[PDB]
Amino acid sequence: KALVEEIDKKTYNPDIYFTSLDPQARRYTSKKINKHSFEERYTQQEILQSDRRFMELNTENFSDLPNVPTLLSDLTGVPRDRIESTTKPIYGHGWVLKPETLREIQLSYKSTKLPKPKRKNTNRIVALKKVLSSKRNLHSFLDSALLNLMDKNVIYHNVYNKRYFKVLPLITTCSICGGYDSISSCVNCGNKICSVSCFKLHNETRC
Amino acid sequence: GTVALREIRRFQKSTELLIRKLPFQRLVREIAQDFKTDLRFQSSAIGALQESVEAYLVSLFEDTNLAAIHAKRVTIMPKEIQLARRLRGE
Amino acid sequence: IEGEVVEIQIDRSITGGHKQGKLTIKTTDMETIYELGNKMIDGLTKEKVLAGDVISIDKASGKITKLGRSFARSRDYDAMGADTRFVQCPEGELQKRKTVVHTVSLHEIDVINSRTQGFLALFTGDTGEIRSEVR
Amino acid sequence: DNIQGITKPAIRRLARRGGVKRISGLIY
Amino acid sequence: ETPPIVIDNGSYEIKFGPSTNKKPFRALNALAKDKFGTSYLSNHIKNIKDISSITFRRPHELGQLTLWELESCIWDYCLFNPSEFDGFDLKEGKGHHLVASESCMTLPELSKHADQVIFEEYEFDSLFKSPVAVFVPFTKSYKGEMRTISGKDESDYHDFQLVIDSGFNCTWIIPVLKGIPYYKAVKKLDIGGRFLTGLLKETLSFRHYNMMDETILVNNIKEQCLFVSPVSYFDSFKTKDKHALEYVLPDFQTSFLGYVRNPRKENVPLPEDAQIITLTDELFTIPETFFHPEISQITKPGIVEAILESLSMLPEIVRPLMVGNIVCTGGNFNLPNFAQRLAAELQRQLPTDWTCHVSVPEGDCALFGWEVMSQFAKTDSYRKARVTREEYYEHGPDWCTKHRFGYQNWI
Ligand SMILES: Nc1ncnc2c1ncn2[C@@H]1O[C@H](COP(=O)(O)OP(=O)(O)O)[C@@H](O)[C@H]1O
Ligand code: BEF
Ligand SMILES: [Mg+2]
Ligand SMILES: [Zn+2]
Ligand SMILES: [Zn+2]
């Protein structure tokens, strides 16, 4: 530093250096200015948002977009009320039981056929008929007591990780393109941007 | 994909003048009768007026929106509108 | 990296982060936010720099070159009593790739590699019969 | 007596033209 | 009928065939109906003339299958159409046994449903269902092609094993010891074929015109034009400018399926009217999501973390054994450079003392697993491990799904 500098003894924080063009002349924290598991770095809201984006990537059609609350409730047992309230997202729908396909499949295998009857009338036969006209939802499987709670425990927590959520470092590249050098965070949206064209494309809709 | 449509047909987003032609025409004839009864409105030159009025309005909403974000609030109260009227000069 | 800097924010030492510092850079077409990584803040605090001017910083070298004072508004820098090397105005983007060419005589290389600080001998003239192995 | 001809959705899309989706109850 | 019928039921496509054959019979497992209502069976989807706007439904969901109606009808279709599937012919299959492959994380109630539907309607005589994992150890029974790649360098069934499957639905990693797989160190990765296709849709939408209704094009593009980053994300990005592929829209008036071209090769100089989508970055960025899920901003750990933790659950004495013999299974593994990339990654993560080797079956692993199961049917240990009709009748459907093939029993 240049030797001999004048100070006024007020403030004078050697580790705090704030300089601007003085359009507001206000610190971002003057008076609280406002108004390694990944479950820790990303809060519950953030991990739930990642989860619902994951489930919305699961679907391959329009019809399963309203099926996302049902699928997520089947996954983690959350009522659809909070799914519709806090997630903040971005006859073919009701399973494959359409009778039209049921009678159309006859022309599929009509080239050769030789069916014969070999069946009885028992409780097992009744259950087979019930399964044939299945029309059941995963919600019905989970709400009912047809599956043991220990089975739920060993099907839900036999997959998740709990202590090590990351072993490789993150690249942290821009969202739009993959400019790997001179990456930087945006002024407002707080998402990494690399190129001028990337910033122009991001500032309109994503930011 | 579900984004590229919103990229290739959203390269041109314009928005248009909206105030309905027939209700506006009825209104202007109504306020023109008392000024001069049996005033025959020419069906031309009314689109230019109906663009100028909307232009002045959207100027008023942009000014009141600037005033609103100046008040850290998104809704519009009468106060913003009246002060926009006064500070513009009428 | 070149452009007009508009604001530096610097924090203290905290358990979550050793130093929470951010830099804002304005070009002729772009404004962007950079985050400092606990060392270069010593770079900008070694000499008293301040915002509202065009500076050049190298990613790998880490040197900060203050070229003077930006243009922004003419009045804000029209009463500084000359100085700032006839101010400046931002030209292009934030970061680019350029080529630096350095011209050096061979004798300068032998003097540089002869001693710990031979560039001083380039002016004092006390090289003193540099050995042949160096040559 | 046709000043009320300008409908409320007309005002709502007029506000939508100028930005900000916040609309009061007497801005119309 | 000594040789059974082997059915590898896949969520995307099922592989049905007699034990005699060396290659499976491939039949789709889905249902796509045109918007005008003329539905088409799974095998007949490929013969349709329009793929722009279809309504889809696949009986097998992420976990397993619930409604057996469509699966039963499709099983009869592949079991009662000798004309469409040549060579195969059957009347009832009374004396015919069954060899099936179903996941180890099946629902016990759904397992009971499957057992009852396979036995008490079609009138089988003997069954054996087990995950595709346990049969791969039987690769030592029969000679075959098996490319073993070293990570470090630049009875008959094998007791020591650790196998990964990656199909359309999801990914499963299993440790197998003493021929009895471990059911606690098993780890499931949700990234399957569905999720890769979804990522493909999103990234093309980030680059080129949308096709989200048209998912068959997404599946074809994923199977055709992708390749895994051979070394790293950044160095593969350095090849984005020099290396690029170009796909052409399939014009229903002209061609039901499109094609991919390389500008270097002049073997296809024919110009075309339709629009051409250039893929220069998404060829290699897409496969990277297994090692970097956070590219798509998910909280998912990753493949390497999953295998490391699964090894961590295993006992320390058996931990080094599994990595010394790893077999790659699944239709996702056919992507080029994937096996070498994952081998390099996990060998880098694993310490110096133990060297891990990955065995790749040449080509797709689906037919490899099918021929492995056919060999298992050939293998005589199946005779000692089989069950009969009287065992099913003397007990209830619950005993067969809770005692022999039950998963909590082997825990
Ligand atoms: N050569 C290939 N390149 C890329 N992807 C492939 C290739 N072959 C198959 N696939 C993908 O693998 C998936 C097949 O998975 P599959 O084995 O049917 O799973 P499951 O047995 O659970 O149904 C398909 O979605 C397909 O996109
Ligand atoms: F049923 Be698979 F191969 F996932
Ligand atoms: Mg399968
Ligand atoms: Zn970008
Ligand atoms: Zn932004």
Asked whether residue C8 is domain-assigned, the answer is yes
What's the CA gap between E397 and E402, in Å, rounded?
Answer: 9
Out of E68, E83, E108, name the one closest to residue A112 (CB).
Answer: E83
Domain covering E193-289 assigned CATH 3.90.640.10 in the classification: yes
Q: Give E169 Cα–ligand 1 centroid separation in angstroms.
A: 9
Asked if C30 and A186 come within 8 Å (Cβ–Cβ), the reply is: no
Query: What ranges in E240-386 are assigned the alpha helix state H?
Result: 282-285, 303-313, 319-323, 338-349, 365-378, 381-385
What was the experiment behind these coordinates? cryo-EM
Closest CA to B81 of E299, D11, A112, C121: D11
Out of A131, A137, A167, name the one closest to residue E117 (CB).
Answer: A131
* DSSP one-letter code for E334: G
What's the CA gap between A203 and E97, in Å, rounded?
Answer: 64
What's the CA gap between E327 and E139, in Å, rounded?
Answer: 10
What's the CA gap between E135 and E388, in Å, rounded?
Answer: 20
Asked whether residue C96 is domain-assigned, the answer is yes
What's the CA gap between D21 and D26, in Å, rounded?
Answer: 15
What's the CA gap between E91 and A113, in Å, rounded?
Answer: 9
Amino acid, single-letter form, for residue A141: F
- Testing ligand 1's pocket by substitution, the residue of E62, E74, E334 carrying the most ligand atoms inside 8 A of its CB is E334
Asked whether residue C134 is domain-assigned, the answer is no
What's the CA gap between A65 and B17, in Å, rounded?
Answer: 34
| CB of E329 sitting under 6 A from ligand 2 | no
Resolution (A): 3.5
What's the CA gap between E223 and E193, in Å, rounded?
Answer: 10
Give the total residue count for chain A: 207
What's the CA gap between C15 and C79, in Å, rounded?
Answer: 44
Q: Give E333 Cα–ligand 2 centroid separation in angstroms.
A: 12
| Chain A, nearest residue to E345 by Cα | A168
Query: What ranges in E40-107 are assigned the alpha helix state H?
Result: 68-77
Q: Helix (H, G, I), strand (E, B), or coil: what is residue C6?
A: strand
- What residues have a C-beta under 5 A from ligand 4, the ion? A 174, 176-177, 198
What's the CA gap between E180 and E401, in Å, rounded?
Answer: 17
Helix (H) or strand (E) holding C41: helix C40-46
| CB of E165 sitting under 6 A from ligand 2 | yes
Task: State the SS3 of E123-187.
Answer: CCCCEEECCHHHHHHHHHCCCCCCEEEECCCCCCCCCCEEEEEECCCCEEEEEEECCEECCCCCE
Amino acid, single-letter form, for residue C7: E
Report CA E168 to chain centroid distance, whole Å.
Answer: 6
Asked if E61 and A170 come within 8 Å (Cβ–Cβ), the reply is: no
Asked whether residue C123 is domain-assigned, the answer is no
C110 CB within 8 Å of a chain A CB: no
B9 CB within 8 Å of a chain E CB: no
Residues 6 or more apart in contact with residue C61 via CB below 8 angstroms:
none
- CATH number for the domain including C35? 2.40.50.360
Asked whether residue C127 is domain-assigned, the answer is no
Helix (H) or strand (E) holding E238: helix E233-238
| Chain B, nearest residue to E201 by Cα | B1
Per CB-CB distance under 8 Å, the chain B contacts of A202 are none
Q: Do residues A97 and A135 lie in contact, with contact meaning Cβ atoms separated by under 8 Å? A: yes
In the block, tokens 């050096």 appear at C104
How near does any CA of chain A get to the CA of B77, in Å? 20
Residues 6 or more apart in contact with residue E227 via CB below 8 angstroms:
E283, E284, E287, E335, E336, E337
Q: Output the residue whose Cα is nearest ligand 2's atom 3.
A: E167
Task: Name the β-bridge partners of E246.
Answer: E261, E278
B12 CB within 8 Å of a chain E CB: no
Q: Do residues E242 and E281 lie in contact, with contact meaning Cβ atoms separated by under 8 Å? A: no
Q: Do residues E38 and E130 lie in contact, with contact meaning Cβ atoms separated by under 8 Å? A: no
Asked if E198 and A60 come within 8 Å (Cβ–Cβ), the reply is: yes
What's the CA gap between A51 and E299, in Å, rounded?
Answer: 8
Closest CA to E170 of E376, E372, E12: E12
Q: Which atom of ligand 2 is nearest to the CA of E169?
A: 4
Task: Name the β-bridge partners of E360.
Answer: E147
Query: Most B CBs within 10 Å: which of D11, D13, D20, D26, as the mutation test of the B interface?
Result: D20
Residues 6 or more apart in contact with residue E206 via CB below 8 angstroms:
A176, B1, B3, B4
Domain count for chain C: 1
Strands E98-100 and E127-129: parallel
Amino acid, single-letter form, for residue A20: S
What's the CA gap between B71 and B54, in Å, rounded?
Answer: 25
- Testing ligand 2's pocket by substitution, the residue of E60, E136, E168, E174 carrying the most ligand atoms inside 8 A of its CB is E168
A181 CB within 8 Å of a chain E CB: no
Please say whether the dihedral angle defined by the alpha carbons of residues C125, C128, C129 and C133, taken in this order, is positive or negative: negative
In C10-52, where do the E strands start and end?
22-26, 31-35
Q: Do residues B21 and E227 lie in contact, with contact meaning Cβ atoms separated by under 8 Å? A: no
Q: Helix (H, G, I), strand (E, B), or coil: what is residue B55?
A: helix
What's phi and psi for E55, nearest 5 deg? -105, 130
Per CB-CB distance under 8 Å, the chain E contacts of A95 are 57, 66-67
**Residue numbers of the domain that contains C94:** 1-100
Strands E326-329 and E357-360: parallel
What's phi and psi for E28, nearest 5 deg? -65, 155
What's the CA gap between A166 and E91, in Å, rounded?
Answer: 55
Give the tokens for residue A107: 């022309």
Q: For E297, left (φ over 0), alpha (ψ -120 to 50), or beta?
A: left
| CB of E368 sitting under 6 A from ligand 1 | no
Asked whether residue C93 is domain-assigned, the answer is yes
In the block, tokens 């074809």 appear at E220
Amino acid, single-letter form, for residue C64: I
What's phi and psi for A44, nearest 5 deg? -60, -40
Q: Helix (H, G, I), strand (E, B), or coil: what is residue E55?
A: strand
